[PDB]
Design a protein around this ligand. Sequence first.
Ligand code: FNR
Length: 363
Amino acid sequence: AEKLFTPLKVGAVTAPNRVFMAPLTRLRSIEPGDIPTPLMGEYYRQRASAGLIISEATQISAQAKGYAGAPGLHSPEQIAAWKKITAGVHAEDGRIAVQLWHTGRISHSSIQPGGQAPVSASALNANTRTSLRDENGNAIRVDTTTPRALELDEIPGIVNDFRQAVANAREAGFDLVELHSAHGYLLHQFLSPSSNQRTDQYGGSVENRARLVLEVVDAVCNEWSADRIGIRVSPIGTFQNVDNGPNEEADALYLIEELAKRGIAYLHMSETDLAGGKPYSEAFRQKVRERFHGVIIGAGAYTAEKAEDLIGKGLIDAVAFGRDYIANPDLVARLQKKAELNPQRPESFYGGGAEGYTDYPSL
Ligand SMILES: Cc1cc2c(cc1C)N(C[C@H](O)[C@H](O)[C@H](O)COP(=O)(O)O)c1[nH]c(=O)[nH]c(=O)c1N2
């Protein structure tokens, strides 16, 4: 019966199981330089039995930065450090995708180049908080800075920054990329009418609001290959940073139909904020499944039992676990053996060092 421990072709790679590691911001990179570390390499290597590791959100550019301690994939030193991390995963016969973001308005002027306002679709504060570092290097929360709206002639540069970051990801040895089009970051700021009041061709209709993300998809497929590209969306519900507007189901199905035309490797649906939301209806899952023929990854407070049920129904192909992967490097073996999980320590999810990061034991 069990399908979680069977292989799955995911674009250009083949996962040996359906138990994926969700992208997890942990804010442990080196500053200055937003540089991945050998400790981050150890953490990912410990989890390399995952069917697929999806990395923490990683900046496409310095402007993309919104959190102190989040890594980039735009500088030589970042590329060199990520090469070591992907090599370590591959040494253990793993597969790893890099999640690429621009945080847009979920950012703060103090970590923007030049100390000026971050950018977005419109000049509306997100009215939330991001993460900085205090003078001792510890993670602190700070109110987001009001963004400025991207001028029309700046949008090709944003598309080019995603393209360049994917070129860099290929050099750095990643198996796949995941475009971060979820959770209220820049691509989702354009997608949502709540964060996008533009009157040019990047605002208004759903076609206009999806224009930027689809330009990015086309640019990165052209740069590398469609079967190397995944995308994460969170198109139903309210996320800390944004909501999906009054026609969220129709708009989501429009976007998914467009993504399918590009033949990309996978659609990763983040179904809920950590703070909760209404479950996806099975009717909606069927409409998604019939618009996207490729791999569908479900995430958001999943259990192994919920994953088996939906995989068995043919509605998703894999599950990404977030917090269970923080706490269980060998989550695959634990789920296969029905072993107990280590307890989670959420106080060390963000920032710090090895404690709460590489010190969760394997069986
Ligand atoms: C500490 C931490 C950090 C992040 C996250 C979660 C948490 C707990 N999540 C959301 C994550 O990918 C996953 O969707 C939710 O954690 C899955 O839910 P479970 O944790 O399995 O219940 C997340 N999602 C994302 O697209 N990119 C990221 O960088 C982050 N950062």
